[PDB]
Amino acid sequence: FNVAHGLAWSYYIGYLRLILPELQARIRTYNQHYNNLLRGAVSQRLYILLPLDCGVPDNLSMADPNIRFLDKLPQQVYSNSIYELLENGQRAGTCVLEYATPLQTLFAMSQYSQAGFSREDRLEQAKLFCRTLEDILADAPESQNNCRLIAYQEPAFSLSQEVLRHLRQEEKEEVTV
Amino acid sequence: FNVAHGLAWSYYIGYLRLILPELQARIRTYNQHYNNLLRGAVSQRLYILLPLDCGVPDNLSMADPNIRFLDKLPQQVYSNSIYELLENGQRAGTCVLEYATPLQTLFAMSQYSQAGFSREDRLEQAKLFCRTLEDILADAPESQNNCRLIAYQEPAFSLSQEVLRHLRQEEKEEVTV
Ligand SMILES: C=CC[C@H]1COc2cc(C(N)=O)cc3nc(NC(=O)c4cc(C)nn4CC)n1c23
Ligand SMILES: C=CC[C@H]1COc2cc(C(N)=O)cc3nc(NC(=O)c4cc(C)nn4CC)n1c23
Ligand SMILES: [Ca+2]
Ligand SMILES: [Ca+2]
């Protein structure tokens, strides 16, 4: 009994597979402007945050003040937000970012006593979710190429620096291959 | 590997558990009017349709012309629709009705070739979903008492008559206990 299996398949089939194809176009269009305006470029991939502690805040800035909402991505109804990543008060990147909502379900199950679902169980299933979703996106037609999973365990950490590491690696890959 | 486990837990934790508590109040309020007006009474339970063939139409009337949209249930934002059930053109009942959306995910997986998910697999998981969701609602605090699962296999059938059978049984139970 592993709720993570079905959560990952549902998150892909009922959301990712539907949004990613429109996403690529929406981002190119936005980038025409963003370029001419802020001489910036928004990454073409959806960045999905996977905190293994299953903590999804109501606003990204609360999880890290260097992640600041910039703009909503326009439609060609799906809502998506562009964020800027700061270093020393200066802009270091911009991207479409959001948390994997299924993890909220895992968190809630660990607080629902009838479930018998411990924090240990929650962490094990959060990792299994990440692994399963990765497998799915690896086999998926083009859709996978439109996003990147960012899974991280916080110690007992700079989320913005983690996102920037991926964004800089993505740019490196783009120009080299 | 059973996606039905996680689908049922997600459907409960991320939708049912959140809507049912408001539901009871919304329905009582509506029933004040519906009574004074059409001398009718809307059942206090959410009826969830579970076609085992995982066929979810865009409109109920297309699945059965004797199921006719009557009104949207008001808010105390969650959208819910009240339907009337017809017999010989005459109204035989009214209730809040909707399909279990997770089944759409099962249908889509059976059409997604990379999944290796056959129709046999789809039916097995649709039944497992129904059984798991039933177990959850049986152990759930009060929430279960606000809805009823209607699972049915169509031959190779009157959906409105199936819903009415449940509505009439619910009324019988209400007055006797
Ligand atoms: C029922 C339809 C909701 C779908 C489609 O519309 C959506 C729009 C936006 C947006 N940013 O505007 C986000 C979003 N997120 C989900 N759904 C899951 O995240 C999810 C988690 C699990 C587990 N399974 N699912 C798919 C049902 N949806 C959506
Ligand atoms: C992401 C948030 C969407 C939530 C909350 O808002 C909703 C409102 C209405 C309405 N009638 O107005 C229907 C509905 N249906 C789902 N969600 C699933 O049906 C579902 C299937 C599986 C599997 N897991 N989930 C929960 C995410 N939601 C909602
Ligand atoms: Ca955290
Ligand atoms: Ca059918």
Author numbering:
A (entry chain A), B (entry chain A): 153 to 228, 239 to 318, 323 to 343
The authors write:
Stimulator of interferon genes (STING) is a transmembrane protein located in the endoplasmic reticulum (ER). The activated cGAS converts GTP and ATP into 2ʹ, 3ʹ-cyclic guanosine monophosphate–adenosine monophosphate (cGAMP), which binds to STING, leading to its conformational changes and trafficking from the endoplasmic reticulum (ER) to the Golgi to perinuclear endosomes. Consequently, STING recruits tank-binding kinase 1 (TBK1), which phosphorylates IFN regulatory factor 3 (IRF3), leading to its translocation into the nucleus to drive the transcriptional induction of type I interferons and the nuclear factor-κB (NF-κB)-dependent expression of proinflammatory cytokines. Based on our molecular modeling analysis, along with the reported CDN-STING crystal structures, we designed a novel series of fused tricyclic heterocycle compounds and analyzed their binding to human STING with thermal shift assays and the potency in activation of STING signaling with a reporter cellular assay.
We initially obtained a crystal structure of compound 2 in complex with human STING. Although the complex was crystallized in C2221 space group with a single molecule per asymmetric unit, analysis of the buried surface area and complementarity between two symmetry related molecules suggested that this assembly likely represented a biologically relevant dimer. The structure revealed two molecules of compound 2 bound in the cGAMP binding pocket per STING dimer that are in proximity and raised the possibility that covalently linking two such monomers might produce dimeric compounds with higher potency as previously observed. We have discovered a novel series of non-CDN small molecule STING agonists with fused tricyclic core via structure-based drug design (SBDD).
